[model samples]
Target: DPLNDPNSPLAKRSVYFDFDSYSVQDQYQALLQQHAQYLKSHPQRHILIQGNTDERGTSEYNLALGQKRAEAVRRALSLLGVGDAQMEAVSLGKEKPVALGHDEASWAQNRRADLVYQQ
Candidate 1:
């Protein structure tokens, strides 16, 4: 499947965010557009936008921040013509970090929104 192809932009599921910021960077526009196109064409497909945060904030604050990040991605996709019903925005807080380390590099990896396709 195209989704499994490493060369496909769809394979790139994570959209990184600036530290303490929820804005979607301009660099990720094309990536979001690609996902939006696929989602528009595949009506049966649904995605969960999981927002995550670094471990520097309180659990409650991180959760809210994560939700905003997820909502940002959801809004971007929606504006690109993907239906709202096809997407769900959720937060993972700082509870699930992809990179386990106490440094900026790892924190950067953790502060991201992930597009997870539901089977």
Candidate 2:
């Protein structure tokens, strides 16, 4: 039956954040809402919020900024009525960036937070 369900957990995406900040824009509210709803529906489900940064700063500074971003997302979710027991946040900083391209686009993509869900 898992294969028959087209929208089964496979259809989803990781959330992104802005540079040097952790605030989610109005555009992402819908995505966050869906994630929260899924978490509420599945008691065993939880999401991991991973914060990362581009290679434009010292590793330590990036780490701190990444942490702020992660916390910002957590706060937003909390305000949306998602319980504390449903999610966790972690900061990877600039030590690990997903994009190898050396351009503004790559940097923009790299500086973000990702969500991993468990059920």
Candidate 3:
């Protein structure tokens, strides 16, 4: 249950991003590092990184942007020694937003990469 425990970094599954950006920030480095360590130890485990976006852009554009966001996280993990077999990156685009408002508060929650583990 290490991954599900609130005290573990894996509990923090979503990584937020700035508008129109796909870079993983320094603040999330530690969080991603924890994931890398976990994956290194659990070789059979696999994760799906689903990227999302707010509803401000065209669906096609949003989908591409989301993909970049997911890839950013994936690349970071690969650099940390997590193998390609352990993870995949995909895009949800502007669908499945956590918030429905028309403001930054809602947009912030929408622009994220979600890490879902495969059991």
Worst 10 residues of 1 by lDDT: 1-10
Residue 85, model 1: Cα distance from true site in angstroms: 1.3
CA lDDT for candidate 1: 0.95
Off by over 4 Å in 2: 1-10
Q: Which ten residues in a row have the lowest lDDT in candidate 2?
A: 1-10
Better of 1 and 2 by TM-score: 1
Q: Which tens-of-lDDT digit does each residue in 1-119 have in candidate 3?
A: 69879887789888999998889989999989999999999999999999999999899999999999999999999999999999999999998888999999999999999889998
lDDT ranking, high to low: 1, 3, 2
CA RMSD, predictions in order:
0.8, 2.8, 0.8
TM-score for each of the candidates = 0.97, 0.84, 0.97
> In model 3, which runs have C-alpha deviations exceeding 4 angstroms?
none
Q: Would you list the rank order by TM-score, best first? A: 1, 3, 2
Give the better candidate number (1 or 2) by lDDT.
1
lDDT of 2 by residue, 1-119 (tens): 32135586434445576766667778877767766666566667677788888898898899998887777777777887777898788889988889988898999888787766654
Q: Comparing 1 and 3 by lDDT, which wins?
A: 1
